[PDB]
Structure formats: C-alpha cells, structure tokens
Amino acid sequence: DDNHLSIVTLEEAPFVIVEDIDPLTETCVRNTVPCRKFVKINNSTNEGMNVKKCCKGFCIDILKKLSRTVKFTYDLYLVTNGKHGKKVNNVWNGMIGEVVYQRAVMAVGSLTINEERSEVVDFSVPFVETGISVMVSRGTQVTGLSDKKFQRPHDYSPPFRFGTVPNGSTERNIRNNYPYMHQYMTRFNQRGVEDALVSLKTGKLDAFIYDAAVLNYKAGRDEGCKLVTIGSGYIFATTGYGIALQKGSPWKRQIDLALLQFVGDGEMEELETLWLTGIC
Amino acid sequence: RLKIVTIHQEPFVYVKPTLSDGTCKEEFTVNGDPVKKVICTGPNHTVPQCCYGFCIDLLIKLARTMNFTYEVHLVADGKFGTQERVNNSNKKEWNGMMGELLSGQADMIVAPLTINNERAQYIEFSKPFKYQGLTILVKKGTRITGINDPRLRNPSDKFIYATVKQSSVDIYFRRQVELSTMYRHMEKHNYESAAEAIQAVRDNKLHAFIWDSAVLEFEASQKCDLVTTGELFFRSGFGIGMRKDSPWKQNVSLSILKSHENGFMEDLDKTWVR
Numbered sequence: 001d002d003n004h005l006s007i008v009t010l011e012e013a014p015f016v017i018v019e020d021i022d023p024l025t026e027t028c029v030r031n032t033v034p035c036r037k038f039v040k041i042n043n044s045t046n047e048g049m050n051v052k053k054c055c056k057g058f059c060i061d062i063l064k065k066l067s068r069t070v071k072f073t074y075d076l077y078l079v080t081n082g083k084h085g086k087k088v089n090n091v092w093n094g095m096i097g098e099v100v101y102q103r104a105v106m107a108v109g110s111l112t113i114n115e116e117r118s119e120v121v122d123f124s125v126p127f128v129e130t131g132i133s134v135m136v137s138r139g140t141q142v143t144g145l146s147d148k149k150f151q152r153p154h155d156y157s158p159p160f161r162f163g164t165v166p167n168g169s170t171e172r173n174i175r176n177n178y179p180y181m182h183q184y185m186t187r188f189n190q191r192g193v194e195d196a197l198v199s200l201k202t203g204k205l206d207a208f209i210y211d212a213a214v215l216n217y218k219a220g221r222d223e224g225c226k227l228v229t230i231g232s233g234y235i236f237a238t239t240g241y242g243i244a245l246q247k248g249s250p251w252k253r254q255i256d257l258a259l260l261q262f263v264g265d266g267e268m269e270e271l272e273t274l275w276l277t278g279i280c
Numbered sequence: 281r282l283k284i285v286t287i288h289q290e291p292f293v294y295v296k297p298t299l300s301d302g303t304c305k306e307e308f309t310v311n312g313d314p315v316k317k318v319i320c321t322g323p324n325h326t327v328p329q330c331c332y333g334f335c336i337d338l339l340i341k342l343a344r345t346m347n348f349t350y351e352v353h354l355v356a357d358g359k360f361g362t363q364e365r366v367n368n369s370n371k372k373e374w375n376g377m378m379g380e381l382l383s384g385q386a387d388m389i390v391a392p393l394t395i396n397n398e399r400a401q402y403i404e405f406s407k408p409f410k411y412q413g414l415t416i417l418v419k420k421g422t423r424i425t426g427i428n429d430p431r432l433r434n435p436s437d438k439f440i441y442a443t444v445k446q447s448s449v450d451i452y453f454r455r456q457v458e459l460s461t462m463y464r465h466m467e468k469h470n471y472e473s474a475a476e477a478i479q480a481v482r483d484n485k486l487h488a489f490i491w492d493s494a495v496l497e498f499e500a501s502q503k504c505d506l507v508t509t510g511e512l513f514f515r516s517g518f519g520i521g522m523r524k525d526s527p528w529k530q531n532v533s534l535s536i537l538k539s540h541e542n543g544f545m546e547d548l549d550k551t552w553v554r
C-alpha cells in the first residue's frame with residue numbers, strides 16, 4: 001500500500017503527549033491516535049514487544065489534518081534509538097535517523113529544522129516558529145546568548161550556572177558557535193526539561209537554554225509566573241519545527257501545500273489556542 | 281549569471297540614483313561598516329540605479345556562499361505578484377515578481393516576498409529568511425482596536441483604509457469570505473506601492489494602511505507621527521523565490537539556515553531593522 005506510511009514521533013509535551021491505552025479495551029480514547037512503542041524484554045537483548053500507546057498534542061493534530069488532506073493512512077511509532085536526532089560517528093540517530101535509514105517515511109514532532117539535518121532529510125515548510133531561548137527566574141539580567149556571562153562565564157565571580165538538554169539542535173548550535181560556552185555548560189547539562197525547571201526553581205541553575213517553543217509553553221504555564229524567557233520571549237537562530245521526509249520524498253510537495261493552507265485558513269491558530277496558550 | 285528581480289521596499293531594498301559617473305555613493309552604516317551597493321536597472325525605459333539594504337546584503341551572502349554571479353533589476357510593473365484572469369477567459373497569469381520568475385525574466389526573487397500556499401503551487405520558496413505578519417499603520421492618536429473596530433467593520437468614506445495592489449494582502453482580502461465588506465472598501469482605495477501608501481498616511485489622505493509588520497514597524501521606528509496596531513491575522517515568512525527547475529534550490533535553503541544559525545541573519549536585523 002503506497003498510501004500507507006510509516007511515521008515516527010517522540011514525546012515532548014505539548015507537541016506530542018503519550019498516554020497508556022485503557023487495558024480493558026486496548027483502544028485509544030476519542031481524539032487520540034494509536035502509537036506503538038517498542039519495549040525491550042531486558043538490557044541484554046534485541047527482543048521486545050510493541051506496546052500499544054495513545055498519542056495526542058499539537059503535532060498529532062497536524063498529522064491528523066495532513067492524513068485527511070493529503071489522503072494517506074499511517075502507522076505511528078515512538079522512536080527508541082535516541083530522541084530528536086544527533087549524528088554520532090557519522091551515523092544519525094533519533095527521529096532523523098529513522099527517516100535517513102528508511103524505517104519512517106516521515107517524522108512528526110517537535111523537530112527543529114537546521115542546516116546539518118537538512119543535508120540528510122528534506123523538511124517541510126516550518127509549521128511552528130522556534131529557535132533558541134533562555135529561561136531564567138524573574139529578576140535575572142541577561143541580555144541574550146552573547147551576554148558575556150554566557151560567552152566568558154569565568155570573568156564573573158560567581159560565574160553563571162547555565163545548561164541545556166544535550167544532544168539536540170540547541171546543543172549543536174552552541175557547540176558550533178561558542179566553543180568556550182559549550183565546554184563550560186556541559187557540567188550543568190540537564191537530563192530533560194522537567195529536571196531543568198526543578199533546577200531553576202531550587203537555585204541549582206541560573207539559566208536554562210533550550211528550544212524556544214517549549215520554553216514559551218513552560219513559561220506560559222509556570223505556577224505563579226516565576227520562570228520567564230529573556231526579552232519578550234526573544235528567539236536566537238530563528239527557525240521552525242518541520243516534518244522530516246526522505247530525500248526526494250514524493251510526499252513533500254503536498255505536505256508543504258497542506259501546511260501552508262492550514263496556516264492560511266486559520267487552522268493553525270486554532271491549534272495554538274488549543275495546545276499552546278498559557279495564563280502567564 | 282543569475283537574473284535577480286527585486287522591488288523597492290525599505291528597509292529591505294533601498295533604491296537611489298547613481299552619481300554622475302554611474303557609480304554608487306560610498307556610504308557607511310552607523311557602526312562604520314561600508315554599505316554594500318549593487319547596480320540595479322529599473323523603470324522610469326530602464327536606467328541604472330543603486331540598490332542596498334537587508335535583501336541586497338542577503339543576495340551578496342548567497343552569491344558568495346554558493347559561487348554565482350548576478351545582475352539585479354527592479355520588477356518592471358512594480359508589484360509583488362498575484363494571479364489574475366486573462367482576457368475574460370478561465371486562464372490565469374501571474375504579474376509582478378512572480379510573473380517575471382515564471383516567464384524567465386528573472387531566475388531568482390530576492391525581496392520581502394511572502395511565502396503562501398497560492399504562490400507555492402507555482403514557485404519554490406526557500407526556508408524563511410525572516411518571520412513576520414501583518415499590522416496596520418495609522419497616525420499617532422488613531423486608536424484602532426484590532427480588525428473588528430467599527431471603522432473597519434462598517435466602512436465609510438470618513439475613514440479610508442487600503443493595501444498595496446497586486447500583493448498577497450490584496451488577494452487575501454479578495455478571497456476570504458469574512459473580509460468581503462473590507463475588500464469592497466479597499467478595492468476603491470488600494471495603492472500602487474507601499475511607499476506611496478505610507479506617505480498618504482502621514483499626509484492624512486489614507487487613515488490606515490494594512491501591510492507587512494517588518495516594514496511597518498520599521499516605518500514607525502523612524503517616523504514618530506506613525507504607529508502600528510500589533511499582529512493582525514496569522515504569522516508569515518519571507519523567502520527567496522526560485523523556479524521549480526532551479527538547480528540552486530537546496531543550497532539556497534541550506535545557506536539561509538546556516539545564516540540563521542551563525543548569527544548572520546540576526547546581524548542583518550541589527551544593521552537594517554532595529
């Protein structure tokens with residue numbers, strides 16, 4: 001079936017949210033979509049079972065719209081080899097790797113378009129604006145990424161304590177652009193966004209540098225509006241999330257046109273209202 | 281050698297006379313950096329003129345990155361590009377820079393060209409070089425409450441609003457059912473160029489001009505008698521335009537992404553926009 005596509009995603013709320021299937025029915029509740037996750041039997045084995053899960057979120061709603069408009073069906077699965085995508089010893093992992101190695105026709109999720117990825121996969125038009133933002137506690141004076149407190153941290157006593165979540169587009173960018181910053185901040189690497197927010201709130205970190213769209217969402221929902229992004233939610237290295245397709249994919253044209261139609265007809269604003277709004 | 285088409289549109293593309301020897305005046309930015317200038321031919325019967333600004337800087341970067349030579353000209357009809365019916369048939373054709381690219385009069389559009397579904401059916405856009413939207417430009421003291429303001433919703437000759445003819449703003453108002461009343465009014469008042477509309481707001485001949493925020497926010501930053509009204513509809517992008525047959529299309533987008541990622545695009549903002 002040339003109309004039936006293998007599609008990979010990755011959990012990252014509110015773009016992709018994963019829930020357990022009701023075990024009684026083994027059917028996902030209305031408005032969610034089935035998504036499988038390969039779960040290993042043990043650490044010494046390739047043996048595993050696909051677990052039926054249920055996916056929802058801003059990017060899953062885009063997928064549903066694409067499926068209806070472009071007229072494909074799909075099997076959705078969650079990546080288990082890495083996360084968004086990193087090149088390790090010249091081999092892509094994560095969602096990018098699934099597409100490169102032809103296990104997925106497309107990747108749908110909070111997947112940042114960048115130059116290096118665009119060399120190995122095609123990306124759709126951007127469907128969410130993003131880039132790099134910096135989250136701090138309200139009061140913290142940081143001008144931007146170029147702030148000397150980041151670029152030349154050890155000129156300050158005490159030096160600023162700041163980190164990212166390694167292995168994605170943000171870390172790639174800092175590594176490429178700001179060598180001293182990069183090697184300094186590895187000591188403050190956070191295992192994920194939640195750990196980072198806890199580090200901010202408990203005074204273990206002064207700043208968290210990460211994907212702008214997720215940070216804006218987190219700031220928007222922060223209990224008491226204590227955590228904010230610098231500037232008015234300023235974005236360094238503006239880009240977007242895009243759908244990754246195989247190089248020379250036959251689906252790219254129609255996916256691009258459909259996304260642009262969704263923006264143009266108000267559908268994308270509805271989705272932002274549903275998934276991305278915050279009180280702060 | 282690529283034929284580049286552009287359009288007058290400050291601060292993306294300034295257009296100035298040459299000196300008497302047919303060269304461009306050496307000028308420098310605030311920071312003391314030389315303003316890079318290119319000879320661009322355009323109408324008055326084309327004459328050589330001097331072009332600079334954000335988009336000219338971007339063109340120069342692309343040409344140096346990807347190793348091509350070029351010549352720049354200004355779109356002959358002065359328009360961005362919409363698709364219009366021919367000869368009261370069912371056949372349509374593009375005008376403006378869209379039309380020049382499709383016809384082969386240009387190989388690349390390098391301009392504040394809005395990326396949208398309708399154009400993307402016919403041409404290839406790069407990844408965005410800038411993210412923006414629409415806003416409304418009015419005289420300071422005019423207090424427009426958004427789109428639903430009674431002066432927009434229930435139009436009269438007392439409060440004139442308009443956009444640029446044969447832009448994507450024109451066609452958006454022409455095609456959206458909800459904008460049918462606004463369109464009937466604007467149809468009577470649309471301007472040939474942004475620059476003319478902008479002046480008309482300062483001269484109180486136009487009360488509101490609906491246009492790109494990248495442009496209008498820059499105008500309001502330079503002219504304290506003018507203000508904007510914030511985000512009007514959805515967000516949009518500017519992209520490089522190319523034919524589907526272009527061999528350059530991958531490398532153009534890669535160079536745009538590179539320039540975002542290494543701070544070059546932000547530096548163009550600091551130079552031309554902020």
Ligand SMILES: Cc1ccnc2cc(C(=O)NC[C@@H](N)C(=O)O)sc12
Nearest residue numbers: 360392393394414447448449452516
């Ligand atoms: C409806 C809509 C929403 C957000 N941005 C935009 C830009 C538009 C536009 O046409 N800008 C003028 C010129 N850059 C061109 O390319 O024609 S329409 C629009």
Ligand SMILES: N[C@@H](CCC(=O)O)C(=O)O
Nearest residue numbers: 084111112168169170211
């Ligand atoms: N969205 C990013 C992950 C988070 C980040 O590194 O900022 C990516 O696609 O790599």
